[PDB]
Amino acid sequence: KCPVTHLTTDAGAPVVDNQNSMTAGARGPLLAQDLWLNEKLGNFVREVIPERRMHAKGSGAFGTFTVTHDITQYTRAKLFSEIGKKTDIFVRFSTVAGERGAADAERDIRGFAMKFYTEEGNWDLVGNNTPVFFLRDARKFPDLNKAVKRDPKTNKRSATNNWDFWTLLPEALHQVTIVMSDRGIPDGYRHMHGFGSHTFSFINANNERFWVKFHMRTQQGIKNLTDAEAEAIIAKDRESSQTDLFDAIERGDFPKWKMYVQIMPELDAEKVPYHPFDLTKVWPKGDYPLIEVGEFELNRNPENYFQDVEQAAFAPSNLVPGISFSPDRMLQARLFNYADAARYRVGVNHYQIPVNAPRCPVHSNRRDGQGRTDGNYGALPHYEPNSFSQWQEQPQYKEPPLKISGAADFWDYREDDNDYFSQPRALFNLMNDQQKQALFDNTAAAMGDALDFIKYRHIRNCYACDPAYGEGVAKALGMTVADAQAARATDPAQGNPGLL
Amino acid sequence: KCPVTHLTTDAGAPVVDNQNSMTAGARGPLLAQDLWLNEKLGNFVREVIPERRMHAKGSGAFGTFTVTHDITQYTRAKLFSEIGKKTDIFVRFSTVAGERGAADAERDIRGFAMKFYTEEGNWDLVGNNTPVFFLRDARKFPDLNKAVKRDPKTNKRSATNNWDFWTLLPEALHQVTIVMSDRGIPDGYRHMHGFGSHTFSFINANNERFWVKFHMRTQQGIKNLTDAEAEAIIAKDRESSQTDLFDAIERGDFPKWKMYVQIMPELDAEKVPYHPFDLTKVWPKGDYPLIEVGEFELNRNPENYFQDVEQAAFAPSNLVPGISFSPDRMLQARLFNYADAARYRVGVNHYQIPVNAPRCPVHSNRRDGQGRTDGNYGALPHYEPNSFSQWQEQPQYKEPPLKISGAADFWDYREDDNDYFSQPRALFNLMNDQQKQALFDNTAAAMGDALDFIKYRHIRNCYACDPAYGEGVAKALGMTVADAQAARATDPAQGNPGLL
Amino acid sequence: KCPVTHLTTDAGAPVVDNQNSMTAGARGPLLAQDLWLNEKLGNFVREVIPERRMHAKGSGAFGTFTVTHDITQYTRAKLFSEIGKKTDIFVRFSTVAGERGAADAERDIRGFAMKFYTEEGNWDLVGNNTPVFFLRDARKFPDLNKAVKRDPKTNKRSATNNWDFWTLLPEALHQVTIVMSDRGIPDGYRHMHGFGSHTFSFINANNERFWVKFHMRTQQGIKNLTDAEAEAIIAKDRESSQTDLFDAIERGDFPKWKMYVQIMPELDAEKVPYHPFDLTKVWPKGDYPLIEVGEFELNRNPENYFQDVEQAAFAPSNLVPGISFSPDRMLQARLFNYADAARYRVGVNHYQIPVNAPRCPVHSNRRDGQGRTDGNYGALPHYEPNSFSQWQEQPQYKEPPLKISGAADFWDYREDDNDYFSQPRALFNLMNDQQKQALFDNTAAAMGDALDFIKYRHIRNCYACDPAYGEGVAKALGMTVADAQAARATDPAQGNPGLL
Amino acid sequence: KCPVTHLTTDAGAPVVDNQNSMTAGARGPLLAQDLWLNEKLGNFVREVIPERRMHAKGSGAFGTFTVTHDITQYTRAKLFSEIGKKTDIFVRFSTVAGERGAADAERDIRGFAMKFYTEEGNWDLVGNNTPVFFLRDARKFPDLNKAVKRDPKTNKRSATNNWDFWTLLPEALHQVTIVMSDRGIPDGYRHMHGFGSHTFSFINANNERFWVKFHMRTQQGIKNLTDAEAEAIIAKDRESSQTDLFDAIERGDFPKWKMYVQIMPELDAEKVPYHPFDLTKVWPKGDYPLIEVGEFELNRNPENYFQDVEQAAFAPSNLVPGISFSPDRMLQARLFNYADAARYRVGVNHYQIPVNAPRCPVHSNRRDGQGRTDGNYGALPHYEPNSFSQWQEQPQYKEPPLKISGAADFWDYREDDNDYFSQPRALFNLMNDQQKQALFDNTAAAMGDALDFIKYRHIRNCYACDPAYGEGVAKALGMTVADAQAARATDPAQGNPGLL
Numbered sequence A, B, C, D: 001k002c003p004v005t006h007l008t009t010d011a012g013a014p015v016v017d018n019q020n021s022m023t024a025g026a027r028g029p030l031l032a033q034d035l036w037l038n039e040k041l042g043n044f045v046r047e048v049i050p051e052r053r054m055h056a057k058g059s060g061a062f063g064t065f066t067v068t069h070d071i072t073q074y075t076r077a078k079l080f081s082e083i084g085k086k087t088d089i090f091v092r093f094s095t096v097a098g099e100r101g102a103a104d105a106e107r108d109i110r111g112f113a114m115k116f117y118t119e120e121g122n123w124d125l126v127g128n129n130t131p132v133f134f135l136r137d138a139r140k141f142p143d144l145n146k147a148v149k150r151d152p153k154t155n156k157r158s159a160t161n162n163w164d165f166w167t168l169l170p171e172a173l174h175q176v177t178i179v180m181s182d183r184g185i186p187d188g189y190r191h192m193h194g195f196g197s198h199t200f201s202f203i204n205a206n207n208e209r210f211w212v213k214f215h216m217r218t219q220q221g222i223k224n225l226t227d228a229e230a231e232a233i234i235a236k237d238r239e240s241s242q243t244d245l246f247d248a249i250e251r252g253d254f255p256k257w258k259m260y261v262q263i264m265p266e267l268d269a270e271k272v273p274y275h276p277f278d279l280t281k282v283w284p285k286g287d288y289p290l291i292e293v294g295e296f297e298l299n300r301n302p303e304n305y306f307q308d309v310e311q312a313a314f315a316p317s318n319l320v321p322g323i324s325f326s327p328d329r330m331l332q333a334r335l336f337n338y339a340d341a342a343r344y345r346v347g348v349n350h351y352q353i354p355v356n357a358p359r360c361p362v363h364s365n366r367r368d369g370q371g372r373t374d375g376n377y378g379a380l381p382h383y384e385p386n387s388f389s390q391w392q393e394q395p396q397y398k399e400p401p402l403k404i405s406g407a408a409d410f411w412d413y414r415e416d417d418n419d420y421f422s423q424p425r426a427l428f429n430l431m432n433d434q435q436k437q438a439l440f441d442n443t444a445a446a447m448g449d450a451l452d453f454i455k456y457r458h459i460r461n462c463y464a465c466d467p468a469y470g471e472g473v474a475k476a477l478g479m480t481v482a483d484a485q486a487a488r489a490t491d492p493a494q495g496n497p498g499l500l
């Protein structure tokens, strides 16, 4: 609004008429020489890009992060180098299974994706509102996509597809318990925590490695919706979380999180009794307590949703000196899969998009590609080694070596670690009676019409985790643990390693 | 299900392990030589194509059309040539404003897109569940897209954007009245009519032209949902119309429509008192009664939604001998905009997709393009004229000339026809008291929080159509027609041709 | 060169090693966590975009245009408004049939594409080094593409495909004569003229229309290569024209053209004895003498060929107030085909590319699309009509109406005008004996191994144009006009309108 | 040719006129309702896909491979299982640096890409006409692309860019010597050998590993062109190798190669004095003599070049049971980079293209993607694990583990192996005096105008390889080894590990 604008073509030619097309007489046929119509409609049918293969529905905001505590003994990362140091951030929150138009207030994981515009590169912490995940090997990620999304023929969610998959992965019971708890539907993005979920690494100025987990704790408090409350909100508003977050920032009610880390010296990874790189497992806070780092707030709604939120590309591979990866098998796949997904979805030149662009010096020698806008590194020599001091590597940032034991092979995770249930059993025993009844009710509702052998399989897995959990679930499904047990002999998945 | 399948790569190499990735020791980093993971994940992030720029949410089915009546005196079209002749069809139903994930049971137009696999080409009748539309010049179609979709900043529907646009187009009141009536929310695709909406042409074996309108009348009966009933269905099911249609076909309860035509001899177009090519106007049935043609049923759910429904491309330009276009200015733009939209969305080689492919001989000499699969017309000479009898034109199908009067220019539609209100006034006076109260209630709900000057503008336009319509709307908005009238002097759109 | 650069990722993270990949031991397998390699190679395989479907091989330069003469009585175009007024330009020269790597010094038309960065929009004059073309209806343009390019099976140029097509278009003899003359191989882009070829329109401040032809005459002089001289240059340099033009600008030897116009009052188009919109015909200079307008020089080599030359998009539709189109049937197709070609080749957001961007105000309300970088018109309302003074049309630039006579139909060009030979006969009689012998020799060489019936057909067409032309061609082919004449009875194209 | 064809649209509608466009009167403007023109031209501008980022210029043929010898003790690969067993193949030959249009007879490596349509998957042996390459780590491959292709500003080959890069890689001297020898320009694809170049692996039925090198030896004899002979061929024909190969097959003169292998037991890789996975090094035939396997002939020209040759996608990752990879660092990158390059260039669904499609059972569960044609695995469950025997892994094909020693790190190749010159010195001493003089002449011609410090650097590296080689090169450049030696002190690349 405000300053009057006069319509032009892309090339800046004045548009004469924006109400009438050019015709051979007043009621005659349309002419090809109606240039503005050709341009207006040709561009119109190319506005849509592919949605994200996962986490398609989302809301974004800009904000800042402030260091409140010193952790420079563990990490040389420049954004953490001093108390008081402020870094600008972009955050996209999301659901997982919904397409672009889907309801915000579904029972699902939420995405918690953070981009930090640092002096030594953008650092993407691509997190979830849960410290764990259903899977611990990336082999299973495309299968999870199909299981939680639409059947190839009914084009609807399928409790049978979803729960057949989940119940054949006993390692999944931890995240299944979390998403079937009261926290499976947060009351908008401001009332949930975030997590890196994976084990990452810190590297200090001494070139020492630590293993690390990020926790982002909501200063607005954990707050949830029951199935019924969510359904009532969806009936009015499929965009309930966008409404909530946009409205909050618009009225100056900026949401805040505190950032903590669990820090584990490199050598401790071979001393702990739990697999320290297993995404289905946390590190107990009694072994590795939270160390406070800083605080971030979201304080600015983007001017244009498509340019800043839809085109936003996060990559776990977007790391900076002093923050690096781990051999978590899931993290390891994400280190390449996001950059690849973004080359397809927003283009090879997607770092030209302002929300993705670095706010520090950049010298990649990336050349050409569709839609090159930014100079294309001009006439500079485009190869290395060269005799012209172009594109010089920076060895001072080299990480210490990472010790390997064992041959290259497909190593059976089930031989390495098969503690599927101790962590979910702990979580069940933390719950009060209401939360337990919610867990049982939410579970039986989600299984809905899944085939009976699948309901029996979940009840068996849940009983193994804790007899009271198996009972509450079996009861809420109107079944018995005895029938669940009797069904194992004829379970059609017989012969299959995740079938216990 | 049924025959056991053994996992291979695209190239047919056996996959050894589909549960574990290849690692440097059991808890070591991931190896690049894990070929199956690279392939599985690289293909995974390229499954999604752009949604349709309009009518993104939809349901599809296969079926057949049977001629029941003789109209060969009006049309030489081969699918109509004999009573009893059966043609196979594909139909996609849709909403308009929803993205891929959006609720089915919104207040919106529904799409009614038909593909007839004819012996002289696929005939697409790309229709709506309404005989008219909001607009009569394609200039305004991209603007309607933005008005009924998401604000560029809030990323939500905007009553202000939507109703500012609508109230500045008095010609739109006809379709606004239809979509705000009880029929703005059909109880699924089986309980709505379809229409070509536009005036088309028939050409008979004598090379005579008729102007024609297609009506497809539901044999299951008009059936609707109130705002409250729709909201309750959405709370359970965003896919309510897919559920309804898929379930009906799956239980053998095949939905049927009867097809009729209004036929107008060419010369009558200059004798009627209404603009006969104006998409905001019908032809009164008293002047041009319905002539029965045939009956179609939908009787087969596609095996794969993506391959048959999501990749389906309709084009109003997909016409056959004996069925052709008119100078309707809206139809005229669609004659090029759909083929162009599909080149971007499903590729230049989209006619290789089975649902789009013709079931008759095809010799286009279309060469190359990404993903060419079908022979590419092999080694045949690829130019015309040639000395080799390749690609010979077919003059026997030539249409009679179309008379033009007037210069090429931007002809102001408002000078040519400005009867905005007589047809909506007729429709209002057909309604019984309940339907009228629904029209008023639905209208005030849809305007929701639109700025007051916009509510005043709709009330003025509605009063001009019929004093009782203006009153019922003003009342349901908690306003008065007097205030509406007083606001015209300061209306901020002053200086603007659609502001009456 | 000069300032030392330190290699980073796109996200600005330092790169540790640019010589060694990350491996599991010194002679072990490659790790997926080698982030720089993934990024470097993933981006590398996306550098290439599609070449132009026509005129793929080219050279570009920046320059300026200066008005030297007053023609404001004929055109209100702002770049021409005063003597001395300077406009910045980009020019791309090209061959036509060569792919990206093909030789510069082939016997072909050359492209002469001009972009003028004007205060009322970019004006593209997309010209050739010839005043005419082979065709006069766009129906035949894709066929010309196939005929002059590679056979679908041999993947080589085919004299049979090329000359079968050409000899079945008698209207083509004019351009065939030009491209087979000594001027079919200019000695680089600096020693050739340019032409708009088509009839365009001027509109003056009085809203009067003139028909207009643009001539751009080389101030370096017409200079050509024989077949033998060209072949010798190709043996050393496939990039001979890039070498020539780049080297000339680099040493300050800036090439200059003078711009002239032929001006014809609107009404004269119905008074001339030649079809004034027929691209196979010029306007004789005796009827419409050249009027001088200005002078342009190319004086700056682009810093980056891909960003400025390969991504350059010209469109005949890029017109400005006071310069517009004509009903030339070929021009009429180009008015839409280039903008469409560019949406595919450089993207819907290709006007963000600096060489394509306007240097004047732009308000198109074009939204979104892949790779949106420039603000996306932020939060401004995105529909018209609106109550907020956004996107207001500009009626002061409206053209006078264009008179139409006749029905909409496929009008046979051969019924309308069939003077195939008078203009080529004039051109043949302008030639001196050497140029004539060149025309005959060049023709027989180009026909090479074309089937005999095709050589006979060219000789017949050439004899009809002028008995001496038919003789010289028949002789250089080692045939006789008598045999050519005897072959017409059995010509396999019998039954075909371009077969005389 | 032969059967008369009648022109239709893609949808199979008859085309009335293919010579005239639809106009408002005979000399009037073009109408938008000319559907055939819209379709014909819209499809026309989408025929071109991106060329290959490397090896863009090529020729293809179909053929067969016959086993002549038993090697089943080394490999369980099914195509080798019996003497007499015939496998169908596709082969694409190429240059490396040329774009689509570039000359065939340039001084360059040639590509020798083989696809074997095997009963357990397509096996791609993506080879070159040389047993080695310039590089031994993939870090340097994009840099080699830029060095051997066009300068970002001159858009021409640059001897300075090319030789600056090459002379700073002493490991490159082996391949530099080969490509500067008489064999740098083979007399077409039929007179050159092929090689896998890399060390691969065989796995036998006992689950034992061997390291292996493939040699494909021409039965038509090594035959070459001098610089002068090549230049003379280019002056006539940029497509000389396509002409040669197509013509040979067309006249029944089918070219044949014999396939041999060098076989090295796994444990020998730690016993040899040369790095056995270093692409700049061969295995001496005295240590590992050639073992004969079979013979292949190319006997069928494809019907359509674009469908079969341009869309052909090879991937080193396309391996079958009994043939696998090695830790060669270059091979390791190609294992992912080709499948990724093809997803961009020919689409995610490129295995639908007949030349790429497997000729054995395929069950990948790859879903959707643009242009899905083939059923999309219909309604089958689309996740694993499932209770429905879909997508079952095949463990019988598991390879033995691969022993790793050392930490994950960037291991400096120059510390591991720095024998740059012994193999090129051997090759120089195999040459007769003519071949030596050719090597010197070809080298000085290729360095052309490269800056002097670069010529000095090549002479130094060549002298180190063999004093006679340094002398012959220095002399042919008109320089002395003494000046070369004196220049090292001021060499501008001082401080750089490949500068000796």
Ligand code: HEM
Pocket: A041, A045, B052, B053, B054, B055, B058, B092, B093, B094, B110, B111, B112, B113, B126, B127, B128, B133, B137, B138, B141, B195, B196, B197, B198, B279, B312, B313, B314, B330, B331, B333, B334, B337, B338, B341, B342, B345
């Ligand atoms: C100039 C006015 C119009 C323009 C520019 C327009 C443009 C479009 C575009 C670009 C799509 C998506 C096409 C694709 O990607 O396959 C679409 C879909 C559709 N349109 Fe329109 N449209 C217009 C008017 C109408 C009218 C008046 C009706 C009904 C009479 C209509 C019915 C539909 C239907 C049913 C679909 C969905 C087709 C399907 O199921 O794939 N449209 N339109």
Ligand SMILES: [Cl-]
Pocket: A343, A344, D343, D344
């Ligand atoms: Cl891609």
Ligand SMILES: [Cl-]
Pocket: B343, B344, C343, C344
């Ligand atoms: Cl496109």
